Amino acid sequence: FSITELSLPKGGGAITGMGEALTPTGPDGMAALSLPLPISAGRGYAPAFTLNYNSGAGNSPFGLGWDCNVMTIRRRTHFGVPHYDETDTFLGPEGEVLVVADQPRDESTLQGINLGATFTVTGYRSRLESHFSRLEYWQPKTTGKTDFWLIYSPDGQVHLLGKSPQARISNPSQTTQTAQWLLEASVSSRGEQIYYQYRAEDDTGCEADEITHHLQATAQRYLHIVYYGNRTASETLPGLDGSAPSQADWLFYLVFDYGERSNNLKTPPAFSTTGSWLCRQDRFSRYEYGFEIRTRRLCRQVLMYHHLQALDSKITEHNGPTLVSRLILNYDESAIASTLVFVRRVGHEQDGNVVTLPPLELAYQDFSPRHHAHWQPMDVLANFNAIQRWQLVDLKGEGLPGLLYQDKGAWWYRSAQRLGEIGSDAVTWEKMQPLSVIPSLQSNASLVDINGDGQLDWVITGPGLRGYHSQRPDGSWTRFTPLNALPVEYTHPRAQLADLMGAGLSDLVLIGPKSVRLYANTRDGFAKGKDVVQSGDITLPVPGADPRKLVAFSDVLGSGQAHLVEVSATKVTCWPNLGRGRFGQPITLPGFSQPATEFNPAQVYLADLDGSGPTDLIYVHTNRLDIFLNKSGNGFAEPVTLRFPEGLRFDHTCQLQMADVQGLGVASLILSVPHMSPHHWRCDLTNMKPWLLNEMNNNMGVHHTLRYRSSSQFWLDEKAAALTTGQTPVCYLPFPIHTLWQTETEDEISGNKLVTTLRYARGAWDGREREFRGFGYVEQTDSHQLAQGNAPERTPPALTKNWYATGLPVIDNALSTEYWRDDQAFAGFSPRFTTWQDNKDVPLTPEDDNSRYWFNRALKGQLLRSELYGLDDSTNKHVPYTVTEFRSQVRRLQHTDSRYPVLWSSVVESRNYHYERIASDPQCSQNITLSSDRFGQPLKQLSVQYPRRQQPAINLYPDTLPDKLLANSYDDQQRQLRLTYQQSSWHHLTNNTVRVLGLPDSTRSDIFTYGAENVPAGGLNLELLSDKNSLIADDKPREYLGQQKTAYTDGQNTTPLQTPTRQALIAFTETTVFNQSTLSAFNGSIPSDKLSTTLEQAGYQQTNYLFPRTGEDKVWVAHHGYTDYGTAAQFWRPQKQSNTQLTGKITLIWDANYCVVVQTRDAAGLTTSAKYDWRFLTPVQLTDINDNQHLITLDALGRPITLRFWGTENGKMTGYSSPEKASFSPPSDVNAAIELKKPLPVAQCQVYAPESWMPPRLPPHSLTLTTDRYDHDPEQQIRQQVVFSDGFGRLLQAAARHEAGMARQRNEDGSLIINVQHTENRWAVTGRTEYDNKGQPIRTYQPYFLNDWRYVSNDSARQEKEAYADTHVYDPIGREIKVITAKGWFRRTLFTPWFTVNEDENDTAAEVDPKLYQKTPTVSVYDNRGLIIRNIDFHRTTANGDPDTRITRHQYDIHGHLNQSIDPRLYEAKQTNNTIKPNFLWQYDLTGNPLCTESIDAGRTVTLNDIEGRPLLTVTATGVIQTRQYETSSLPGRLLSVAEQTPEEKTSRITERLIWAGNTEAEKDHNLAGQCVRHYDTAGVTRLESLSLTGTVLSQSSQLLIDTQEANWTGDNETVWQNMLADDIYTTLSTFDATGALLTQTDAKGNIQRLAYDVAGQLNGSWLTLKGQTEQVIIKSLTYSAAGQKLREEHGNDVITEYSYEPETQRLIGIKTRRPSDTKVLQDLRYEYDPVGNVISIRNDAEATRFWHNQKVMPENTYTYDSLYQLISATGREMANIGQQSHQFPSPALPSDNNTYTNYTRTYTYDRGGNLTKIQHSSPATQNNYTTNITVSNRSNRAVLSTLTEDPAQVDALFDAGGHQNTLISGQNLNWNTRGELQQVTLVKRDKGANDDREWYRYSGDGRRMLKINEQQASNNAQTQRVTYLPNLELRLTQNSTATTEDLQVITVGEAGRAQVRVLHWESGKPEDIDNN
Ligand SMILES: [Hg+2]
Ligand SMILES: [Hg+2]
Ligand SMILES: [Hg+2]
Ligand SMILES: [Hg+2]
Ligand SMILES: [Hg+2]
Ligand SMILES: [Hg+2]
Ligand SMILES: [Hg+2]
Ligand SMILES: [Hg+2]
Ligand SMILES: [Hg+2]
């Protein structure tokens, strides 16, 4: 919940690109990318699309790999073509099998619409639930209508799929056969709609060939236009009645263009077009639904249009809807495959110009057979003597072919195996093994089973088998063919296949990995010389019947079926496989040909060579071969002819095999020669898989390279690794899988690289469902490769080991064997199987193999275990930083269907260990879902924080730790077992026409806290915690944390609903703040019998406990976050909002279309208005509460480019000129804009240059120009800033234009030049940072001056030592563990699980007397909740002293709140007295707001806040009751008054009153609307009269109370208050520049100060005009360092001050003040610091002033510290007669006194609690030796000068209850006011009736001193000195009973302590010798 606030967006900053992202690799191993599309959110409900790349995906309307899909329901095609009857299975939008969920019912209407038929409606649900959406299949029972689907989403959306023909994919020959129902319409619960309009495939733009060969090419559908932002709210699906969309009814249109519209950069594509979409070169067909679906189109542009005329009637649209955004998709077009290579975002301006982002480029692995072909002998087969009668086939499905051969007279197989070392790709074949089958007893053809040992997967043919009847042996021998190279229905032929196979096949001969040549047995058609058979309407060839034609199965179409193919001398012909034995009409694939006398089918091979994967045709000649590449199934490319190795000739005695020996998914060439040696040769045409995305470049300096590796190779690696161990690997992946192996990111700006490397094992293939389950092991290594020049210390590679469930028990059960071993870790997790019964999980052991199969399958994909390591040189390198593990539960929801149950898989337990590489001492936490409801919402959850382990016997911590640190890291807070128990309830709205799940109802938290002995071995788990003996059983005591309830409204009724409506409108939220026990904090502060009423008035209410337990009565809650909602017709938009019942509503006024808020009216009637740019729906013009205007403009990409503001000040129009009075177009080039000069009528302008890294080359950058005065001010300056970003959008540096001066240089090649020179083009460069590819700032640079705004190269910065860099080192967690400063000192941080060790620059100094600080780190010690329970320091005053361990302890209660803190000193005292109180005790409400504080230093403070979080009642340490009143409940709730009452007072006093302005014309004229304009306070009244356009104070005034009047603003009559005031009105008036910086300030006496600024906005001049006088200069000139620090200051007295900085740190080391007139250095302070920055010496190099007789040299001051940086000693000079220090002030030495100065040494002593207890002053030469003692309380830090007491037990009585000292020194009482401010010091107490000498004080309401009065009452003389403190002015008035003897005004110019100048002006009583002013 939040209050709507209108504001304008800001310009400039970091440059972003298109937001494309690499998607983290899962156990699927694929490369994936996502690319956002420019889609307007519109009103909120909008279609959602992203363009996605997956390396495993085929062709699509976006080319290979890329796709962008719409939600669909479809028939399953995985196991074969559907039958288009009730035996079919359906898939949901996520690909999950749908299962019938309830009984079919009759329905005639939907959403009030008459459907024109009776429908049978069947509910379905996903087989594996995730979201619990509900699906319905609507099928007509009566005539004239068609089926459709609905989806009821769990968030209340309803979706309509495939109702109208435009949104269906159907068989064009049989329109009843529907394959896919596409999303057609959606509607949300709040009345928003979306309609999806598709375009059907057609013949437009195609050639005659394409049109002729593909009949009924109208099946395919392409999303075309999405209509959204309905103009009229409706709860009905749009188009449900069957009507087509009307564009007038909508505000937004998303359009996918397929080539119809113009595609240049000088005209916007028009919404309406007569254009023809393009016909792509790679047209392709798919057949898995049983009929041809032809794709001819590619999406070229994604276009966003707005109905501007409807969004803003001031805009007229003659041109149709207006283009607001545009994405261009450019392809590398090819007849083989098109690929997306170029993606660009473009915006069009009204003047015809365009503005663009840099394009995203993508490149793909090419296939170049000519370049890569070279034959290698296969030496590995040197002893393998088979030539012709062997096969290279993958028998077992290992993903690489093995050697299958007979050696008389037995059969043998040799599996592939790794050759040489793991990680290489070289292959050999292992020792021969016998085949489990015997070929000779198998019948010809017929399935067989071989070793080892897949179910029926191969077919065997051969002359010796029974059934063999061929006429052409030999060559015929026993051969093997994989079953999956044959049609699905090979085992049960019918139709065309059956006619083709006639009386069976004789021989099946592989001519490719998946291509089979066929020969028929002698025929049964009783025609044996017939070479064709008629099969219905097609004529099939009889295979083998014509010996001059090749007949084969092969996928020449790349669609995933085994098609029929005939190759003859003249043509290639394909009959496509339509499923169910059916084959389609013949398609010719030209142009392969060969002379008829030469053609020989024996020389033809069919194999996918490029991985497209239509199969390519290889024709073998005797000395060469012709490669005919397959053009997307449409024919063959011109032949590429490659030579055989010299000088071999291929003939009928040889063998050539096309086989995938690389596991690349492409065929290589394997040649066996009978005479030659060696006998076997191979040629690979490629080593990488073609067509995979391998390069990206965003053209902003980020380059990605992707490398892949076949999973077959990971298989070989795993198998070889398993050799050394004893295990035996499970094969997987018959089908080859190409895994993403490496991702290399290159930052072209920094030159830094990052290489992420993946390694896979335990791949799992499920033979039953025929799916790849994933890899059970994924290992990722991140290695930085930093550019040359960077520091040696770097992040070392991080290794993450991950194990994932595959759902195959044989794998999963063995995973935990590889887990990092810890003998004290808790027991590992096992999956939990349950069945859902009577609304609960009942655990079960799965009944049979089937049930076991499905329950296990549901586990797949879940991360089981993750370990993170750092691969450095540490002794702990093998111990993880962290370990996580997870437990899955699978719940059976239904199993009526005999095929499969419905299951819901989820994570029920997780465990997280933090070891930080200390094996013996981790933290561990665990989350458990105890129970959840039927839709998976948690009902009971538990979080467990485990206690630290008992101290181990063997110390694994580093021996560099300070002595005893480890022992002192133990604390009782580490030793509690903590169980946070959360209960939750939910509303679910469900019936046939409604579904909204998981609306929160209520939650409650409690916590159980137990001693460590309650932790079982080994660990808690769901079962132990659900048992009746449980630590969390209902009868166990627990502590209440709180509760919350969400209240719902129907939108009209004020009474909350019992059950929400579908709109789920939240009326308010109810949160508990107090229970009985927390209220104990107010005992003795608020009377018991007045408590309820008080809490009630504060806004709290009583309610019952939720999930109430025995004995629980009431809690106190706050209701907050109220909304009043509009009607259904207003889309239920919020019309009013308020935080609580205590404050008023804000009114929200929407545009006519309810898209945006155009006006807010707050509870005091103050109005803010916004005009919008309707191209982007962003505010561009704001009218504020004072009617001032703020205006920005946007470019065509929606980026702010100008800002202006104007309006009245003091009733007169001022500010920048409107665009009407002064036009301004901002420049397009940074250089032109930098040349611009005054006047500019804008406050700001931006120029964007995101393309600057594209060619002279700069990182992406933006320029901001800012004026500092309004355009009619002739003194307007133009500030200039350029900000550079890298390719990841991270800030590299900022450059600001400075005044001319000395700077370093950038030369033309971008190199930094250290030598300084004068320049007129000077810039200060700040924030200069080098990052690594993770965004870690690894180098930071000191600010510097440069003679250019342009970027200095990174390499140049790394080279120059004088660039002053700090280097930062990070661990694999991203934590910084070391910083080496530019000076070479360093900081270091050690992270361990229970404590963090910080070492600073002094601590580590000795490694780089510094021995003093050695081993004195600061340590933070943690409990098991991440809370800091100890701070440990090490105290030492001498290098050889033994360190004192100083432990400060913090205790957090079971609510997690800071309960106590105690310092080392009091803890030590408490060791022999446990009643001693800690420094602080705190009590809180249930939400953690402090209610009470008991401080031994400051006493007890108690506070009650109201439900708005505002202080209502406070009781101070001294018993004062302070109460605050605020505005009533229809106002914003601002402070109106402050009242206080002392325990002695009977009635309260009103000490403050605030009066707030409304918004009358006079108040807007002064910009006062809503402001506090009169504040009566403790000293008088302040009045605000005038504010500037920038919110600065133009005029304000003060009046003080008269001296005899105390603040008490009683009554409602302001006149009596005014009557309490002194007459003097002190008015301060100012003027400011357009940036709000002060220009002039006139004080209460009319003296004017004037300031002036340089071009960077730094003060560079200062003047004063005393009243009645002429202006005089105060600061003549002032220059700055690049870090903005004072450099050279020249005052009006001509004196010059020069500040010197240490270049590496910016530390101030010199302050030199000199007088030019006589060239005299007056003061020259030189500072020296230790490495951390303590001042260790100060020298004054000037000679002594003339006040000191015969002395010239001033001694160096030396300072020494203890290890806690307390000042231990100091030396310096003091005047010789100074005497012993007191509160008194010395008389000044005068020139004629001839005084001298001497040396002193002070030594300081501190206790163990920070108290300074002794000052020893040694000044030997002058006998000025003494000791100041301070006595510290034994129970607190109150401490006093020993003259007040020497007894620690008597110190506290010298203070009031709030710790304010009551006596300054003896004889001098201190009085404090009721706000704890010093009210009076009595300087001399006198016996009655005489008068005291005293000084007293008055303060403003915010604690600023306004008045000081000093009364001397000596006779004589009685003197009163009065000091009034005003802005820049002191009035110092001295009076006596008879006269005024001095009237002094002190003018102050500048800041006190920063070279402030004071001017003394007397009105009377000026001393004679001093000139006035
Ligand atoms: Hg799409
Ligand atoms: Hg040969
Ligand atoms: Hg041959
Ligand atoms: Hg070759
Ligand atoms: Hg296998
Ligand atoms: Hg543990
Ligand atoms: Hg208290
Ligand atoms: Hg500008
Ligand atoms: Hg005020």
Short mmCIF file of N, CA, C and O and ligand atoms in Angstrom, two decimals, residues 37 39 48-51 62 67-70 223 226 254 256 258 299 302, ligand 1:
data_model
loop_
_atom_site.label_atom_id
_atom_site.label_comp_id
_atom_site.label_asym_id
_atom_site.label_seq_id
_atom_site.Cartn_x
_atom_site.Cartn_y
_atom_site.Cartn_z
N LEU A 37 10.50 -7.19 -25.43
CA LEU A 37 9.84 -6.55 -26.55
C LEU A 37 9.17 -5.29 -26.03
O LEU A 37 8.70 -5.27 -24.90
N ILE A 39 6.46 -3.42 -25.31
CA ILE A 39 5.02 -3.53 -25.21
C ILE A 39 4.47 -2.58 -24.14
O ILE A 39 4.91 -2.63 -22.99
N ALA A 48 1.78 -10.35 -22.73
CA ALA A 48 3.17 -10.48 -22.31
C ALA A 48 3.92 -11.40 -23.26
O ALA A 48 3.55 -12.57 -23.43
N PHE A 49 4.95 -10.87 -23.89
CA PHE A 49 5.76 -11.67 -24.80
C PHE A 49 7.22 -11.32 -24.56
O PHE A 49 7.54 -10.18 -24.22
N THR A 50 8.09 -12.31 -24.72
CA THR A 50 9.52 -12.07 -24.75
C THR A 50 10.04 -12.92 -25.90
O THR A 50 9.52 -14.01 -26.16
N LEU A 51 11.04 -12.41 -26.61
CA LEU A 51 11.70 -13.19 -27.65
C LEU A 51 12.73 -14.08 -26.95
O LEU A 51 13.57 -13.56 -26.23
N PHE A 62 10.73 -16.98 -36.38
CA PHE A 62 11.82 -16.10 -36.00
C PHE A 62 13.17 -16.73 -36.33
O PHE A 62 14.19 -16.28 -35.82
N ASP A 67 12.38 -18.04 -30.69
CA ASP A 67 10.93 -18.08 -30.83
C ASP A 67 10.22 -17.14 -29.88
O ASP A 67 10.78 -16.65 -28.88
N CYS A 68 8.97 -16.87 -30.22
CA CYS A 68 8.09 -16.09 -29.37
C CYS A 68 6.69 -16.66 -29.60
O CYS A 68 6.11 -16.52 -30.70
N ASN A 69 6.18 -17.34 -28.59
CA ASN A 69 4.98 -18.13 -28.75
C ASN A 69 3.83 -17.58 -27.93
O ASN A 69 4.02 -16.76 -27.02
N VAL A 70 2.64 -18.05 -28.25
CA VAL A 70 1.45 -17.62 -27.59
C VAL A 70 0.93 -18.85 -26.83
O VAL A 70 1.23 -19.99 -27.20
N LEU A 223 0.42 -14.77 -35.19
CA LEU A 223 -0.16 -13.65 -34.45
C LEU A 223 0.13 -12.37 -35.21
O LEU A 223 1.24 -12.17 -35.72
N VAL A 226 -2.68 -7.61 -31.53
CA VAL A 226 -3.27 -7.78 -30.22
C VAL A 226 -3.94 -6.48 -29.83
O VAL A 226 -3.28 -5.43 -29.74
N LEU A 254 -0.72 -4.09 -30.29
CA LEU A 254 0.60 -4.66 -30.50
C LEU A 254 0.56 -5.38 -31.83
O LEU A 254 -0.31 -6.21 -32.06
N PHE A 256 2.52 -7.49 -35.00
CA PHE A 256 3.66 -8.23 -35.51
C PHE A 256 3.63 -8.13 -37.02
O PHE A 256 2.64 -8.52 -37.66
N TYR A 258 5.22 -8.93 -40.81
CA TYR A 258 5.89 -10.02 -41.50
C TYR A 258 6.40 -9.58 -42.88
O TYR A 258 6.65 -10.42 -43.77
N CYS A 299 8.84 -12.99 -39.02
CA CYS A 299 8.46 -11.74 -38.39
C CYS A 299 9.61 -10.72 -38.49
O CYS A 299 10.73 -11.00 -38.04
N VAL A 302 8.35 -5.73 -34.60
CA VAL A 302 7.36 -5.72 -33.54
C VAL A 302 7.04 -4.25 -33.29
O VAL A 302 7.93 -3.46 -32.94
HG HG B 1 5.20 -13.61 -30.19
#
